[model samples]
Target chain A: MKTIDLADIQAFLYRESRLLDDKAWDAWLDCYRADAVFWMPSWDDISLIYYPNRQGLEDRVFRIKTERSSATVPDTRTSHNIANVERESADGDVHTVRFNWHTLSYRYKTVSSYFGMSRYAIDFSGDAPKIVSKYVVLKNDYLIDIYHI
Target chain B: MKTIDLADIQAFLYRESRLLDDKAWDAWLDCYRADAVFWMPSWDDISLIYYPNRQGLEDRVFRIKTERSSATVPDTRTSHNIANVERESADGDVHTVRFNWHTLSYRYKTVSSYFGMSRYAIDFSGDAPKIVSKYVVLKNDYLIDIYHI
Candidate 1:
């Protein structure tokens, strides 16, 4: 496709989460720009950090696969479900695709859902699509931070 | 491509970094398994942390894109150069791929290099390949921790 469309864009997002949920790291990583930033903003009341934040030690599930911490000693199981896909704008080789998503990470027999509003700047210049950047904002954050988290 | 081989496996590893350096996030993510772990093990003298570590806030470049951190303020430019790729073993749909890499991240007219040894477990069960996991060890870590870091 010379230029990418909605259906294709939707599939591209789906495959990205699929790879992530499938623990296909290299493949999942392929979804971004070389200098791409996968950001998940932190919240301070009504003001969500405008930055592109990525999950880290702040959440136990972040380094689950790493041998580094008790954060994921037993390892957490995850299923990334992304939906409400919509394309908002396109800037040159970059397309801004926004969607709603939640990742279910299971550990110690407890299933936790981290739902958020997400957007991606995807590049479609090549035969295949790549995510130039990913911005995710979690809404159900405090719930886990207070309860199961 | 029924059962993947070394020559092609090497390409898979190369493509991963290529996509990464190319800013092809989605494509890079496609190189890993659904539940794959991309670990960059931390080090301490002759005994490195055995856990799989991924680079994060300990450095300025880890959270470059996320609006949440001061870690990456002015933004850093990186060109991932991978070479000396070698396949170590094969287990089920998993193939072990290893390589030597150094990423040159530029910012403020200064160039910084993060060089390390990298390995990935690539799954070839499907027509397209995926990385089941990745492990990285850096010999030049202390250099950065002291200077230019």
Candidate 2:
């Protein structure tokens, strides 16, 4: 049984956040496995806001990269802060982690932020750890003009 | 080294949410330690919407109980949903937890909801686990009438 290093996990988490903050969509998408589950559940008494498969996630990223996405307002800069990361389990090559996160979105000289937590089920059998499933549960129901996960 | 049961921790978290939803202020306060730090930090450029000491929390709760407080709109109902609770760490009798929460506030026939996450540093040295420090990081910056964590 090979044990995972806490420091390596923490560094990965931080690097992921930094990618999102820098709006490096390609690099962010590369953090996931080929069959990853990227889900951001909703509080609309519904199942999910958007739970995309690997292909769906890639398409969404493509849209964002091409500036053809209407999901968020234009020229919005986002800063994601992730903290209190906990390792739930490390079974074989799979690791489960949970953490709290907040995002500050700035647009048109006005800034807005949202808070949420995420559970990441990752697979570390490859050259690098790839996310198998990412569950983002948001706290705020109402959002401003532009909101992105 | 005494290991904490995750089920027990989950139950406590659920119970605390229920107390708040029921407006059981006293019971909610009882979940905190005498020197607890109940902080609800903001997403503003600076920090902290309100980081209250135990006494400050008690006073705020008292004001709410007295019905003389103008902090919240009248006849407002709030429903809090807590999920993805993970145990961050356990050192001696203290355990740290991270979770995601969404709150729906209803007032004047209007419903508004907000999302955020909380990191709880809890002490289990007493009869019941008590919060030593609770850091609530809110994601949504724009608020409606009155918002309380």
Best by TM-score: 2
All predictions: root-mean-square deviation over Cα? 20.6, 8.9
Superposed model 2: Cα runs more than 4 Å off: A1-31, A34-149, B46-48, B68-74, B143-147
Q: What DockQ class does candidate 1 belong to?
A: incorrect
Candidate 1 global CA lDDT score: 0.58
Task: Summarize candidate 1's per-residue lDDT along B1-149 as a digit string, tens digits.
Answer: 37666568766666766765655555555565556655555543232333232222123223323433445455555676554455668888778866555566776778765654567777788888876676676545433321111
Residue-wise C-alpha lDDT for candidate 2, range A110-135, written one tens digit per residue: 65667778899888787777988988
Candidate 2 residues B1-149, lDDT tens each?
Answer: 55676667778888887787778888888998878887775444445545456887788777677763555556778887665565779889899987666677787878765655678888888788898898886655544322345
DockQ of each: 0.02, 0.03
Clash pairs, model 2 backbone: A113-B139, A114-B139, A114-B140, A115-B139, A139-B114, A139-B115, A139-B116, A140-B114, A140-B115
